[PDB]
Amino acid sequence: HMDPVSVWGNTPLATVDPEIHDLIEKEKRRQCRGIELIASENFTSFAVIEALGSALTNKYSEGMPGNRYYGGNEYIDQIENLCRSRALQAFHLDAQSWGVNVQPYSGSPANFAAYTAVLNPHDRIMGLDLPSGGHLTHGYYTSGGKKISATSIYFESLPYKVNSTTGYIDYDRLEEKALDFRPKLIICGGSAYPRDWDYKRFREVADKCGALLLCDMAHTSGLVAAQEVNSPFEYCDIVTTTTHKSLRGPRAGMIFYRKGPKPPKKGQPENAVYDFEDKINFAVFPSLQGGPHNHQIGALAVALKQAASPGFKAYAKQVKANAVALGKYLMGKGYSLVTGGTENHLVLWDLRPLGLTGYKVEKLCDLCNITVNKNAVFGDSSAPGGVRIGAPAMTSRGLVEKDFEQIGEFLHRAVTLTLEIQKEHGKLLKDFNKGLVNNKAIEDLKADVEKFSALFDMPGFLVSEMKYKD
Amino acid sequence: HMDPVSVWGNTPLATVDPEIHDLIEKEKRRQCRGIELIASENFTSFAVIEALGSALTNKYSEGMPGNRYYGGNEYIDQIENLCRSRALQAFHLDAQSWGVNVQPYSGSPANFAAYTAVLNPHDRIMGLDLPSGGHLTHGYYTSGGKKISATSIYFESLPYKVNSTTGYIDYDRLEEKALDFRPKLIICGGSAYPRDWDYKRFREVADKCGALLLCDMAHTSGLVAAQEVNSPFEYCDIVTTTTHKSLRGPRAGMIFYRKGPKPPKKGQPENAVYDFEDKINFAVFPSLQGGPHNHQIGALAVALKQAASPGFKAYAKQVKANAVALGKYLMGKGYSLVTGGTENHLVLWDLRPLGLTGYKVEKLCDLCNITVNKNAVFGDSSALAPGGVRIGAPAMTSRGLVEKDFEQIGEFLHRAVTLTLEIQKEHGKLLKDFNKGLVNNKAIEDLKADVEKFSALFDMPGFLVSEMKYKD
Amino acid sequence: HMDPVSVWGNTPLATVDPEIHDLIEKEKRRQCRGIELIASENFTSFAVIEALGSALTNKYSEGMPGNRYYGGNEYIDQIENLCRSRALQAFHLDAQSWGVNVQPYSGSPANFAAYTAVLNPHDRIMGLDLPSGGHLTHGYYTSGGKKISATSIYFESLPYKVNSTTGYIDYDRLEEKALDFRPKLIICGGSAYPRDWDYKRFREVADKCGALLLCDMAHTSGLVAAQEVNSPFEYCDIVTTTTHKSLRGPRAGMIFYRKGPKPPKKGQPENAVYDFEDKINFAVFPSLQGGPHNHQIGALAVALKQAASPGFKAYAKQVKANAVALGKYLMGKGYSLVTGGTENHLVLWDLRPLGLTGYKVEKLCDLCNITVNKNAVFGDSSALAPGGVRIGAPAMTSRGLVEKDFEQIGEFLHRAVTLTLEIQKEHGKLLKDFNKGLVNNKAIEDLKADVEKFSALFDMPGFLVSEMKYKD
């Protein structure tokens, strides 16, 4: 005999699986009791989460709205249509000039599908080098020649780099490389680049070598929606993005592409129109993905309505102001920030002038409930040299500039202690790690961090309902 | 000024976004007021859905447990380790002999990562042809040579087929083709094959041509977990799966792979060990994916605990018995089922003897709240109007239906196809003319009313019917 | 100080390099004092050899006549245009419907350039499997999956096979394979297939799967020119060939290709024309080759004039008659010929029923001045010691031998194979042991003496035996 539906199918998680419920409750407390500075993380809304955890997960809906491979999609089609239209609206796009596919499962799927749409295997791509700030999916192989990303396996990558003096993209070297290498696709946007992008100059380079131009705006998508950074749509053929970073939605991807008449170009016939739509859609399905995750699409529609609000514009302005304030505090203490500041949501902190690796600082911070990630900086070839710090998550908890200065001081205390441990125990990991055991100053820093963090509000769930309030 | 956290971030969906809320509520009613027969669909538990919609979505955790590229993973690591251990336990695997990666975002990502782990670009693969019942990601290109799946673009595919008269896999032709084509990887498992698989024979073929053997058990994984169909782990090097079909979990993928000593093989070195684990993990991350979706992984752990329960074994038995009972009713009316029955959760219904396409039958059924999908059958070339319909039992079995209820489903389907014939008989076969017969059709309205009255007799997992916005 | 031009540059080979001169003189004697049966060899004319060894070797002439990358090509252009026009005439082709590129350095370069012209890397090809009689460059990889030819590396190959019983091409399995595999190019023609080709059926299969059709007529090109076997030009898009086998010219290749209006085909545009010429020329140069070898082109023009003569048609008839007479003689004794005879210039002889390898038979024959080559037969996996020996009539027919003379060759081969078996019986099957039987073997010496006496009865093209250094 089967279990009655009510028993297996309607009983709450707390009863069906106390082990997982307890771990989720412990993770909720952790998210509350630390300083969360991973630049790619955010805290999304309870409304997004309610759509994410919904019966939308039950539906197979391969295809496009109105052109599906399964029956039963009368409401899933309306949700997807709404998501697509809100995506165009959130980025201020004319629907006769731009379309969007909202089915990519995440950012890496979105990029690989965009490449598959416009490239054959082994076609050439150029993206920002990972140590210069680019993403894995922009064609990462190592300076020792190890192919890491599938984008350097199925396609042929040659990365472009920042200038070693300024830390900004070296646009003349990009142009020289593109004219020599002749890529079919140039990628802009990145994961750890602290400045805005000259999309006009990227378009000039693309046109000079005949390449397509794609922007991957995953990290700054929220700032783009709020019109707080340069818009890639003015100059790029394709724009990809995640939805869970500064855009503050579920984990998903989107692919935007031009539609309609093309601008005048020499050699190009008159009245030509863009031809990306069908290729992009086909690449997502049936080429690469299967059934869309409709709970993600529904959650994304919610996030995109929230991103078009005046409150979200104020949030995006605050993210930038908090990152500047943090950078100014760290630079005042004498620390080295790549490019000497920031124009977006993150700072990239070079730790090599202190004699520290990113692993050591990240490891110590983690023990103090300060959540960062070690990060490559220019020169690194696979313990990198830097740490990356972002403002979106803690700005979502309501922190403003003075609070981000306190974050700077906690970061200052953490690095000061990492130096003292390394001076006392040594720079070799086996020695250093003996400094992280029964260290009263780590425990004191952890305690002060927890005190500071626990008091702020938290989106996504009710603190008053959580299992672990201590 | 920013909105307070309570306004934008803690307010319920019903207030923040009434439009999306209303559509979810309409979809909730649609799922429990019709007959849901898509063989790849299920109705998952509220406990799975509570984990899916959780703060686990906020975490970046690239890497593996204990070996991450970010801090903060004390609890995400425990959740992922529990998910992996429960996956091995759900399929009765020894941790010394099998490992599993639970980060694939869905089934197609799981397969492409498994292939990327063991194949170079353009290496050769052989899977079941799509019109014979294989999946897109098993190397699908069309009989006209059009490459459709990326698995026929980035790799070199040569599909194997069923016997054109019996509907069973032609194992002799599989072997002949494999010895000529020399694939690096043979794939078994499928999307619309109504019979079990001779994994032992697949292993003999793979050994004869030196290929790896992978099973994609996506559709029947729940039945595998309940030991109700043949276990691919006895013979396959790698087993991939989704988790949202018969397994009744969230939408995700897993890749199982052998570990430890290799069984004795001629010319193979002594002490040889399997070498899949590092390659498969690396393929998933950093090669193909980014951040794991930890809310899916947590939800999957719940589903895997539920799949190990006595109740779930009874469920899998009932899925099979319901599919058999439905098939018996349909052939009793004279309809044509591929292989003339089923050994799993689905039947594949060949409509071409009736002069119908699956598109017509799917469309009329949809108007009656009977949710199926049109499906390719052997010989088909049209994806818009293939020659069959595929019917599955997992979803309705999850609402508590047993054999007598699936016989009534058979009668509703018989009415639907009878009606589809009647409309084609009057209005004609061209789609433009057929669609005119679907406006103000009293027999459609009657059948729709009967389907909904029948569907309302049963409970519904995942949400409380008593609390939904659109009641009756 | 430099040597005077007369010393280094005008002095004959006999004085400048006695060592090489003596070896050439020894090879001249070897060629006219034994029985030369390698099916891909011939004895070309002195006139061809005089053009081959000429000042034409000094010229760089990249490009096409009239469109070159170097100056100075007034006369090289006239030679190449004469070579191309004579090539079309030799094969009875109208210049409005066929063109030809005569720059390929040999046969394997010609095929790889033709493939490069119409295929992208990894595009799919189908040719006759090597143990079934196809060439290396028709996509050869082994039954163990080892890629041998670059045509199985840079392109994706699926060979088609002969019937294992009859030795004839299995046209039904060809069609089935082509419809499953969907090749871009199907190749016909071969190296060791002893029957003619159903080009009409190959065209039917190519049309059914949308493939281009290419015939590699290297071995039988002389018979084609003489209209003594089926013409591939009636049905194939492209025809490649060497020029040194039955065509009796220098070592070189040619690529023939269709021009002008395409024949009507459903879905194909009205007024569609062929588009091979520019792609094929570009593939040869600048894609793959550098400077043409104009001394080969001039020598080829000579051979193509000779091939258009009444005398050459009689030679091609006699080649076929000699091969048939040899085959009937060997079969009367009980030797196993593939397909039980021949329709061209060669027989393929399966030694496995004797418990012999082609290597043993080739080695013993060589000691008797009977020159053959060991050859794969259906099912072989060993290239060192295949199970067959291949015998061709072109070379000895060029020395004027007729049917009764080829029956004498049959008797010599029977003696040699009998002796091979006797030695294996006495000394063993292991090569180390078998080789001991080849020392001071009176029967080998007897057979060698009979072979040279016989060979000395006939004239010899290409050089004057009366003036050769090693007389008798």
Add this chain to the structure above:
Amino acid sequence: HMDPVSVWGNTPLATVDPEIHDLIEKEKRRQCRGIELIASENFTSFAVIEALGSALTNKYSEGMPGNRYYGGNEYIDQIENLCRSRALQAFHLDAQSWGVNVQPYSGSPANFAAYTAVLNPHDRIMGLDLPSGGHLTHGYYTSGGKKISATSIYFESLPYKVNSTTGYIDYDRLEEKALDFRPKLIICGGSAYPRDWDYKRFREVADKCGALLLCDMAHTSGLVAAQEVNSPFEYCDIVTTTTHKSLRGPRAGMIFYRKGPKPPKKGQPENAVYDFEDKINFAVFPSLQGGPHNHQIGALAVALKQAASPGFKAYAKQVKANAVALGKYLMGKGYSLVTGGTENHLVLWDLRPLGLTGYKVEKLCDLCNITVNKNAVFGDSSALAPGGVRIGAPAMTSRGLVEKDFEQIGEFLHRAVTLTLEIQKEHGKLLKDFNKGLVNNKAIEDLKADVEKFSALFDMPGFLVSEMKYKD
């Protein structure tokens, strides 16, 4: 009835084919009565030509000496063994450290086989950019992105360039690109680079990025054998070459490769040995080529004996002195030479400062019996009309010309370019305009007369002027 062997097979070319014979005699006269300055051309010896035009053309000999796929190779094996050993001797190589394959049909086949030996499809290579002086087969695609050479289709190329101001290889940019691009193979050597190569720095770069290092010494191979330029063998893993340029042999290619113990390397284990030999041989045959052209191999053995002589060393010294003398004469007239001089056999002459294309000068020169080729210089994109002319000394040095004669060649070139300008200023700078300048131009006719008068007097290797059909 067949033609008697004597009639078709022993009759001389002059009687069998008067049309081709006459064209060869006209080409012999053309070679005598012009100034031949194509830097890749030479006049080879009669002794080489006698081996080239010989019965060696009749033999199939696939495989290696002592390990063939055909019988009858007792003397062909001795010829190939002698060719290989003479190749090692001519370049002063220890046979325990170096081996050589002498089967490549020409230079482009040698390079493609060397690449295929050590690279998989789409592996990365880096060679000198064609407008900077590299060869097509070093990975040539255009600055507009058009893939031209097969080496940029089947492999992934990124060329390195010369310094835009000095015309020398930019070694710092080479290193920067190699570290960014990470090629598997770096190629050095060129077709139009007028300076020697810093192989030591190339080896430093290759070691830094983990690449193999190959030198293509085709153009300067004769100078390398005479030890008149830097030896690539000191630093390169593989050395390819043609044999018909400054080496003065037949048209063929060779691939030299390291053998034996590897030099100490940190990551490399102890007692490591080179593993190129079997891969190189396999790439030539059976991967890419078919039967070797034994008449080429025999002729090459002759040329390699000649290259090891003291007279050949004096020839190489004179080639260099003649190229320097010519460059000094041209620069003394105010012309622009790339890098301002030469260290080898050629000069590269930049005509853009005069407002001329290489097409115009090439074409005027050809009308005056001055044979050059237009040639890309740094920055060019047009293959129809590049900006330079390349001038080489090997061919006329082989006719016995010394420094004073090459100064006269300078004045003939100076006269030719002066006419080209005069025509340009009069008739115009558009080809429609210009080609009117080359009609009934008395100065062109006068220059041609003076060139023929000068050229006809010099000795000619390869045939006897006293015997040629056209002495006027």
